[PDB]
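Notes to self after the Tuesday call (sharing in case useful).
The group wants a holo model before anyone commits to mutagenesis around the pocket. I volunteered. Ligand is calcium ion. Logging inputs and output together so the record is complete.
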Amino acid sequence: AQSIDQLIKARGKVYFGVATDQNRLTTGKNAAIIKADFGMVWPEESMQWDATEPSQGNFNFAGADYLVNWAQQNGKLIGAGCLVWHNFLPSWVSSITDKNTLINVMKNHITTLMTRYKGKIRTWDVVGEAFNEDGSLRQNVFLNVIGEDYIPIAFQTARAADPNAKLYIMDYNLDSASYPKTQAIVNRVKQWRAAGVPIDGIGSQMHLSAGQGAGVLQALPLLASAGTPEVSILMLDVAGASPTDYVNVVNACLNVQSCVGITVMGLFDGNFNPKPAYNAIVQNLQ
Ligand SMILES: [Ca+2]
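Result:
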């Protein structure tokens, strides 16, 4: 009966969120569930580079506009992204080898997307999956052609394009304080923020095997130690939809003042009926 997003707001957090897209909002009972239980929606695909700028200069916003308008009309916060990362990246971008050209292309992409939705977007994932597992920077086209300054540039461009949005760097496999990747992103966000880079948040996307949720009790505090005003959580997957892993992640967020909420990607079975993880989360937040 009770809404998870309502319950998490009552514990002082901002949102319980879900990642969806136009195709699912128009099918059956998807819109109703989202209205009842979630306070934020994110486009799963409609805002990625190969969706929005499949050919340079030729932007496609049909699906993203649909999601944004639906969320606005139904009072849902909007997260969007990812602006800069190696996935969903057309080959016309990764074939570029000229530094100033790539700088201009990356700025045009950031500025066109954020300007279109200026003032409407709570969180922009500006840079995604920038780190290797060993803590070194991922050798995507931006790093190779621009260098490591592409991460500052991308964040300064976004801040200028829409100063109202919270700007996030996001990555996966940050679920343990013992991982080199978790420590490296903290150290580097610290350095970037000291040099004035407007990284408002770190988003931890979690591919959880059974038992890895406990790790977040110690990793989320470590991530919050980079000093961003916000951190957040995305549940990409949980092995066996294990209730205990879900509850530990929720409790990690409740323990970290700067954690604003949790998003799940797509807790419900094929007939849109709550699963045990659902009930466990509600009972924990109750
Ligand atoms: Ca994992």
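Two things stood out.
The longest strand covers residues 230-238.
Residues 1-286 form one domain.
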